[PDB]
């Protein structure tokens, strides 16, 4: 009930982000603090990706 993965599934309606949760296919959330970590590395191209 926990293992999950996604290559390309559905997408949201108003905005066009991928969906959420294992009930749908859904992708993980790359929130604010992880963007702060990727900025703090100096790694910028992965953030653009």
């Amino acid at each position: 009930d926990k293992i999950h993965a996604r290559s390309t599934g559905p997408y949201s309606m108003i905005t066009q982000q991928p969906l959420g949760g294992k009930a749908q296919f859904g992708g993980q959330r790359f929130g604010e603090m992880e963007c702060w970590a990727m900025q703090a590395y100096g790694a910028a191209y992965t953030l653009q990706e």
Partner: protein
């Protein structure tokens, strides 16, 4: 208020607070090519594995 005594979502409420466009969909988005599972200890691996 609409039905069920819930206040309607006006135009400024698409931006304000935590549920706005800024702190929810602009800075941190759901991504594709992702996964999630539980972890266990792997003491036979090398450090970079």
């Amino acid at each position: 208020t609409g039905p069920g005594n819930r206040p309607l979502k006006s135009l400024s409420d698409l931006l304000k607070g935590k549920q706005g466009r800024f702190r929810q969909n602009l800075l941190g988005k759901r991504v594709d090519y992702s996964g999630r599972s539980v972890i266990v200890v792997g003491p036979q691996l090398k450090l970079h594995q």
